[PDB]
């Protein structure tokens, strides 16, 4: 109904496959190399999606790029949690049609706790009965949910944009605004997951040669250049709740 929702529905990325070889045995190396490839492929989609959001061109160019490079983990985790919810009713992690994690794969990836964290998020979409429209608004807000403590190049354009995406989430909600407590709480719950995954992928990149885990070009650069800004505390999520 809003022009806003029209736009979010129209630009929502479609299916992305990982290219995983489902004939080879599950192995840390094969599973994580396919996750890394998936990330690279999804990142192409996230860029094209983000550039198409209402107001996104408002930002300075370096701020457009920064915000994508900080927020892609949260975004992709949130969208994967939704895929899992809608395809397999949260029973397994639907990273892609050719890379669905069962318990066994959760274990083999050496990321079990984190997977459980993500399956939990996924169950939340069920337990809270989140709508497609709430989902799209919430995902758009995650793009604007992590920034350098010292601010962006043009911080005022970012603030205005984030303020308006909050207003939009509020509009598709509008005792009732207990929903807002919960949706904001659910949004916050993405961040600690993303942080754990940021530490995991960082350590994995450092030790990648020794474990034959393959990182694609743009993933290696981003995980070595931007991700450490997060881990070092230079760049931090915006939480709703303290």
């Amino acid at each position: 109904q809003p022009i806003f929702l029209n736009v979010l529905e129209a630009i929502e990325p479609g299916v992305v496959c990982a290219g995983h070889d489902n004939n080879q045995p599950d192995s840390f190396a094969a599973l994580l190399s396919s996750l890394n490839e998936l990330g690279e492929r999804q990142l192409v989609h996230v860029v094209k999606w983000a550039k198409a959001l209402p107001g996104f061109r408002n930002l300075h160019v370096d701020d457009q790029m920064a915000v994508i490079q900080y927020s892609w983990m949260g975004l992709m985790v949130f969208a994967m949690g939704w895929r899992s919810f809608t395809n397999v009713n949260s029973a397994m992690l639907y990273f892609a049609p050719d890379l669905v994690f069962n318990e066994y794969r959760m274990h083999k990836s050496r990321m079990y706790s984190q997977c459980v964290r993500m399956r939990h998020l996924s169950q939340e979409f069920g337990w809270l009965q989140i709508t497609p429209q709430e989902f799209l608004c919430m995902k758009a807000l995650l793009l604007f949910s992590i920034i350098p403590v010292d601010g962006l190049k043009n911080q005022k354009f970012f603030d205005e944009l984030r303020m308006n995406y909050i207003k939009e989430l509020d509009r598709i909600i509008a005792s009732c605004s207990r929903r807002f407590y919960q949706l904001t709480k659910l949004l916050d719950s993405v961040q600690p997951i993303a942080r754990e995954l940021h530490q995991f992928t960082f350590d994995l990149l450092i030790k990648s040669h020794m474990v034959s885990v393959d990182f694609p070009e743009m993933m290696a650069e981003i995980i070595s250049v931007q991700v450490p800004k997060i881990l070092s505390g230079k760049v931090k999520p915006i939480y709703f709740h303290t």
Binding site: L43, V44, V47, V61, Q64, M65, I68, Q69, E217, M218, E221, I222, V225
Partner: peptide
């Protein structure tokens, strides 16, 4: 960066 090349 490969990212900035992709972006711009």
């Amino acid at each position: 960066s490969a990212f900035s090349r992709l972006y711009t």
